[PDB]
Design an enzyme around this catalytic site. Sequence first.
Site, short mmCIF file in Angstrom:
data_model
loop_
_atom_site.label_atom_id
_atom_site.label_comp_id
_atom_site.label_asym_id
_atom_site.label_seq_id
_atom_site.Cartn_x
_atom_site.Cartn_y
_atom_site.Cartn_z
N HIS A 88 -25.48 -5.90 -2.69
CA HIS A 88 -25.84 -6.59 -2.09
C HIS A 88 -25.47 -7.42 -0.71
O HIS A 88 -25.14 -7.70 0.00
CB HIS A 88 -27.72 -7.54 -1.88
CG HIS A 88 -27.91 -8.36 -0.89
ND1 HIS A 88 -28.55 -7.39 -0.38
CD2 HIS A 88 -28.36 -9.31 -0.37
CE1 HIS A 88 -29.50 -8.27 0.85
NE2 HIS A 88 -29.01 -9.85 0.48
N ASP A 125 -26.79 -1.50 -4.03
CA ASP A 125 -28.00 -2.16 -2.78
C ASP A 125 -29.70 -1.85 -3.95
O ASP A 125 -29.50 -1.25 -3.37
CB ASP A 125 -28.12 -3.17 -1.96
CG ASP A 125 -28.29 -4.20 -1.47
OD1 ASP A 125 -29.34 -4.55 -2.05
OD2 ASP A 125 -28.63 -4.25 0.12
N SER A 172 -28.95 -9.90 5.39
CA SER A 172 -30.29 -9.87 4.99
C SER A 172 -31.52 -10.60 5.08
O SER A 172 -31.85 -10.37 6.54
CB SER A 172 -29.85 -10.30 3.76
OG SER A 172 -30.76 -10.86 2.53
#
Length: 209
Positions: free
Chosen positions: A186, A158, A70
């Site tokens: 995610h 995601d 991320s």
Amino acid sequence: AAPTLYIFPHAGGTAKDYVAFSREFSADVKRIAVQYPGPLESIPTLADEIFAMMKPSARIDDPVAFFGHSMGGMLAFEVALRYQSAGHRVLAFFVSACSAPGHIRYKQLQDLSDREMLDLFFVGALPTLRAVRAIAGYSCPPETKLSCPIYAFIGDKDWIATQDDMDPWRDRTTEEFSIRVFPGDHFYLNDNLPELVSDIEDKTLQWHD
Ligand SMILES: [Ca+2]
């Protein structure tokens, strides 16, 4: 003589969250999980800080690789760029559930940290809100690229990051690009830890000698 992988956690993520991730690797790879210091910070300035502390951990001759999940993906990319310009041996860059760097800078980062009024269309929401501010203020020029292969990893469910927004990471490298889709959201990596790590390890050792 053994490559070292730098692990960059997500926004709100610590080095402790990546203990299970690091544990899946064999003795053939060294793992250094980065711990972030934590309306004053941007991705490049934090990358400058991380790079200053990180550079002495490996010799100029030592082979290094980067992993980012991320927000960690943007920071790992930025620290890897600094390593390359400093003359370090960067083997590969592993980017997980992170969109490719945008070319424009968005002036939505001048909002107050009390974005609760605008968000309502509390302390626990502050780290996620601070990340949105850092992401909207982060841009990279089209010419800025790595001279090492990029390996992208994404979760099929995601919504924060998709294959379409992760695909332009191919334009952030001069070498090879590969994208792998895993089942999950995610935080798909928690359920796909053995296959993700075996993939990262194989590629790190592949480019190593
Ligand atoms: Ca595990």
